[PDB]
Amino acid sequence: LRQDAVMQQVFQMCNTLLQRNTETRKRKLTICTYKVVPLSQRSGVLEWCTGTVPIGEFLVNNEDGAHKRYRPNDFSAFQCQKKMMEVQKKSFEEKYEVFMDVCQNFQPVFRYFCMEKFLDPAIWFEKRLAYTRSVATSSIVGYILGLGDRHVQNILINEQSAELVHIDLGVAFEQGKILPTPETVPFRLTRDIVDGMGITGVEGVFRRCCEKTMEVMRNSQETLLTIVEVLLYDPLFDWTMNPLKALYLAQRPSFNKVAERVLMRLQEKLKGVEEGTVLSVGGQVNLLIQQAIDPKNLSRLFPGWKAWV
Amino acid sequence: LGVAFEQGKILPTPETVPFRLTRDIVDGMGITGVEGVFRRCCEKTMEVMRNSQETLLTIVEVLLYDPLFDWTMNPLKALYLAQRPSFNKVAERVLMRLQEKLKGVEEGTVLSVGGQVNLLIQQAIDPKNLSRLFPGWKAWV
Amino acid sequence: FLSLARFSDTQYQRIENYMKSSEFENKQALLKRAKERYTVKVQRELELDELALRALKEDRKRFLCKAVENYINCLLSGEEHDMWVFRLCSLWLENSGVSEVNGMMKRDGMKIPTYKFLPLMYQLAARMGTKMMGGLGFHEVLNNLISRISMDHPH
Ligand SMILES: Nc1ncnc2c1ncn2[C@@H]1O[C@H](COP(=O)(O)OP(=O)(O)NP(=O)(O)O)[C@@H](O)[C@H]1O
Ligand SMILES: [Mg+2]
Numbered sequence: 001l002r003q004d005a006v007m008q009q010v011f012q013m014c015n016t017l018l019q020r021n022t023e024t025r026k027r028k029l030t031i032c033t034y035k036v037v038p039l040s041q042r043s044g045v046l047e048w049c050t051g052t053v054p055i056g057e058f059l060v061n062n063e064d065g066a067h068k069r070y071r072p073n074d075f076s077a078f079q080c081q082k083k084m085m086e087v088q089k090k091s092f093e094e095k096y097e098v099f100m101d102v103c104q105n106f107q108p109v110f111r112y113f114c115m116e117k118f119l120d121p122a123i124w125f126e127k128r129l130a131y132t133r134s135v136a137t138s139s140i141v142g143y144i145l146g147l148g149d150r151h152v153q154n155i156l157i158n159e160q161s162a163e164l165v166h167i168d169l170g171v172a173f174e175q176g177k178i179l180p181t182p183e184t185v186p187f188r189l190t191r192d193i194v195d196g197m198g199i200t201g202v203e204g205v206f207r208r209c210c211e212k213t214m215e216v217m218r219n220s221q222e223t224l225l226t227i228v229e230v231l232l233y234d235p236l237f238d239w240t241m242n243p244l245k246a247l248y249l250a251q252r253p254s255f256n257k258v259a260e261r262v263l264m265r266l267q268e269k270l271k272g273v274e275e276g277t278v279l280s281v282g283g284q285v286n287l288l289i290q291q292a293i294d295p296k297n298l299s300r301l302f303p304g305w306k307a308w309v
Numbered sequence: 310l311g312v313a314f315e316q317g318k319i320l321p322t323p324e325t326v327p328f329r330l331t332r333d334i335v336d337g338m339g340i341t342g343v344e345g346v347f348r349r350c351c352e353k354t355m356e357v358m359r360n361s362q363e364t365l366l367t368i369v370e371v372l373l374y375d376p377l378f379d380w381t382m383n384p385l386k387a388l389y390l391a392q393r394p395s396f397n398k399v400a401e402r403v404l405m406r407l408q409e410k411l412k413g414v415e416e417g418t419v420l421s422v423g424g425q426v427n428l429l430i431q432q433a434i435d436p437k438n439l440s441r442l443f444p445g446w447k448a449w450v
Numbered sequence: 451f452l453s454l455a456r457f458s459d460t461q462y463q464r465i466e467n468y469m470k471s472s473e474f475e476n477k478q479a480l481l482k483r484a485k486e487r488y489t490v491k492v493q494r495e496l497e498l499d500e501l502a503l504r505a506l507k508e509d510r511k512r513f514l515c516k517a518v519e520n521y522i523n524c525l526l527s528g529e530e531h532d533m534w535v536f537r538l539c540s541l542w543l544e545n546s547g548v549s550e551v552n553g554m555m556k557r558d559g560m561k562i563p564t565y566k567f568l569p570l571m572y573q574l575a576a577r578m579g580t581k582m583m584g585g586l587g588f589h590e591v592l593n594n595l596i597s598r599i600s601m602d603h604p605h
Contacts (some may be wrong), residue, residue, distance in 0.1 A: 092505055178477050180495050243484035247491055261472050271419065275464060278412065278419060367537045374543070377576045 001044030005036035006237060007145075007169035013227055014141045021216050028130075029137040029213055032158070032165040049167075051159050056152025059110060059192055060309055070109040077309075080106055084303035085252075092300070099299040102308050108195035114162060127162040129205060132197045134163040136209035139187035142166070143288060144217055144224070144269060146262075148176025149249060150188040151305045171249070173232075173262050175241040181250055181302040189292035192309055202289050210285045218281065221270040228266055232259040250302055312390070314373075314403045316382045322391055322443040330433035333450055343430050351426045359422060362411035369407055373400045391443055452531050455520035459537065462513035465506065515550050517541060522558045525566060532566050539570055543577060546588035556591045564599040571599065 011031045018024040018031075034047035059066045060077035067077060080102050087098040114131065118124040142150065148171035156165035176183035194201050217224065231237055240258060272279040274287060291297060298307035317324035335342050358365065372378060381399055413420045415428060432438060439448035468474060481499055485492045521538040524531055538559075545551050567574060574596055579589045 174473075177473065178480060180498060182477075241480065243480065246480065246484070257472075258476065261476075267417075276408075276467075364533055364536075367534075367540060371536050371540050371543075371570060371573055375573050375576055 001036055001038040001046060002041075002236065003170050003239065004046065004168075005038055006231060006234075007172060008033050008036050010145060010227065010231070011141070013224075017220050017223065018137070018213070018216055021219070023212050024216050027133055027209060027212060029133055029209060031138060031141060032134070032156075032163055034165070034167070049156055049158070049165050052156040052165055053159060054153050055110075055155045055157050055164075055192070056306065056309065058113065058157070060152065060306070066109045066112060067106070070112060071107055074107060075102065075105040080308050081303060081306075084308070088303065095299045096296060099295060099308065103191070103295070106308050108191040110192035110196040111198070113157070113196060117159065117162075128196075128198060131157075131162040131164070132205045133209050135189075135193060135197070136206045137213050138164055138166055139189065139288075139292075140210050140213040140217065140285075143186040144266070145172050145228075146174035146176070146266075147172050147187070148174070148179075148183045149305075152309055155188065170245075171241075173239055174265065175239065178241045179246055179250055179302075181300070184297040184300055185292045185294075186288050187292055189289065190298070190307060190309060194293065202293070207285065207289065210289070211281050214281045214285055218270055218272065221267070224270060225263065225267055229263060232262060250304070314380055315406065316380065319382050320387050320391060323441070325438040325441055326433045326435075327429050328433055330430065331439070331448060331450060335434065343434070348426065348430065351430070352422050355422045355426055359411060359413065362408070365411060366404065366408055370404060373403060391445070451520050451524035451527055452534065455517050455524055455534070455537075458513050458517035458520060459541070462510060462517055465510045465513065469506070469510075511548065511550075514541065514545060514548070515554070518551050518554055519558070522554065522562065525562050526558070535562075535566050536570060539567075539574070542588075543573075549586050552586050552588050552591050555595070556586070559591075559595065560598065564602040567595070567599050568603060574599075 011033045015031050015033070018029050032049075034049055036044070036046040038044040061068070062077065065077060067074065083098060083102055087095050114124050114128045118127050141147075147166070147169065149168065150166070154166065154168040156167055157163070158165065189202070197206055198204075232239070240255065268274070272281070272284045274284065279287065301307045315324075330343070338347055339345075373380070381396070409415070413422070413425050415425065420428065442448045478499075481495055485496065518538065518541050521534060521541070525535060525538065542551055542555055574592065577592060578596065579592075582589050584590060
């Protein structure tokens with residue numbers, strides 16, 4: 001649990017940075033955090049987010065899932081999961097056509113979360129706006145820190161405030177790309193996530209908030225790089241990926257050179273350098289949004305990540 | 310023109326000036342010195358170099374992989390220049406250094422055409438850098 | 451033709467950069483150290499990684515061939531972008547082992563006017579060889595191309 005506690009402070013630093021900028025303080029761009037109190041090298045205790053439910057439990061529950069309740073005629077969650085695992089040991093083209101076929105018979109229904117919980121139009125608009133701002137802020141910060149393993153069970157949504165909470169932050173600094181099944185998406189922006197943002201989708205509040213968050217990240221590059229440098233040289237911070245962790249994450253029935261490479265990769269992200277070229281805040285945000293919503297990248301991903309969800 | 314691609318910095322006496330901008334060179338430019346025609350022309354030349362970065366980088370790539378192009382320094386050449394009484398990694402490092410020059414990156418930061426030109430002029434005319442140089446280069450001249 | 455050539459070269463360059471990137475080496479090094487129940491998962495990873503490698507190599511070859519073809523067409527379709535012959539030669543010299551690239555240069559590159567190759571004549575002549583003669587070989591195409599250029603502009 002020490003790794004989770006370390007990630008919580010970075011979220012606090014990201015929260016503190018966002019508060020002191022007038023552009024993001026007006027939009028109330030913040031990151032949901034929970035206290036983690038490690039007790040030993042093997043056991044620990046952490047805060048339980050009361051009033052929060054996993055997004056996977058709300059959407060693709062077998063008994064009373066959102067997809068089953070609203071779209072009985074569509075493919076079930078079990079059916080979609082079974083199909084993806086079958087095409088796992090197949091060609092990339094076969095994977096892509098399977099993913100499109102599943103997505104054709106699996107329409108997002110996540111937009112109904114705010115409708116059934118906030119009948120008042122004024123309250124419903126506030127919660128939807130807060131949800132869109134929360135996703136945009138978390139996605140940019142998660143990309144900056146290279147957060148990975150953002151599957152359905154690792155994301156919590158507050159029932160009262162409709163704000164996403166990210167848990168299980170063990171994978172970070174783009175260690176997810178080192179997995180046997182690489183993470184080709186900087187963050188989770190699946191159809192359910194976009195559908196809950198309204199009819200406008202990623203366009204509008206989500207895109208502007210992502211740009212505003214990126215500007216704060218770029219303006220505080222010297223601060224952000226220094227904080228990560230302190231973390232990466234912590235002897236007790238086991239952020240590097242090992243075969244035991246890699247196999248555990250995806251299961252089915254010199255330290256100095258790595259840290260310097262991660263720091264360089266973080267530095268080029270904060271300056272907008274992606275593929276050796278300088279990209280503006282708007283251009284970088286557009287690239288990140290496009291990569292996350294690209295169906296081809298989602299097809300290559302692990303079925304347990306539930307890209308179709 | 311045997312010495313190029315910053316191979317002079319590898320010499321026993323490193324070349325700390327990108328080019329020769331000594332007092333005689335500046336004095337012949339007029340009373341205005343580096344300010345004016347020299348600075349504007351340097352900025353205009355840098356803009357052309359930046360706008361044709363993909364063209365310039367492509368050409369140098371062809372040159373650096375020429376088997377008969379002995380552009381790398383050797384101890385025999387280094388002592389000959391300053392006398393008194395894996396190739397692939399070396400090729401790639403020059404290309405990266407050339408690429409950051411074309412994009413304005415000097416010390417890891419993005420610099421505009423005007424800022425980059427000012428840095429080059431300041432480095433060349435810096436008396437401290439000229440002192441370290443080999444006297445055979447005649448920095449005072 | 452030039453716009454398609456530039457984009458195809460950019461995609462090929464991105465794939466080539468990824469192959470030589472330190473991230474690719476770190477990912478490969480993890481599998482090598484992992485391989486040294488347990489045996490079942492190891493032999494799977496040595497099969498998916500090569501499956502990903504063959505797909506990446508095929509994509510690189512397709513992008514490289516398309517870029518070379520479009521660069522030749524752009525050169526034959528005008529004279530404003532004659533400087534891009536350096537990129538066409540750079541791709542050809544660095545990928546002399548590809549039969550498709552050598553065939554396209556023989557079939558279509560011979561129609562390109564010789565005077566466009568004069569500025570980089572020094573590098574073309576330095577790559578002449580004999581060990582790999584053949585109908586589709588790079589050396590024979592290079593020798594025929596160099597001779598044809600010397601035909602038009604001996605001086
Ligand atoms: N901080 C938290 N607040 C609320 N619920 C939580 C919290 N952490 C975990 N949960 C719940 O616990 C479930 C299981 O996740 P977790 O406790 O992390 O065990 P886990 O899935 O095994 N993670 P890991 O041990 O790293 O493989 C989640 O789906 C959440 O519903
Ligand atoms: Mg979990």
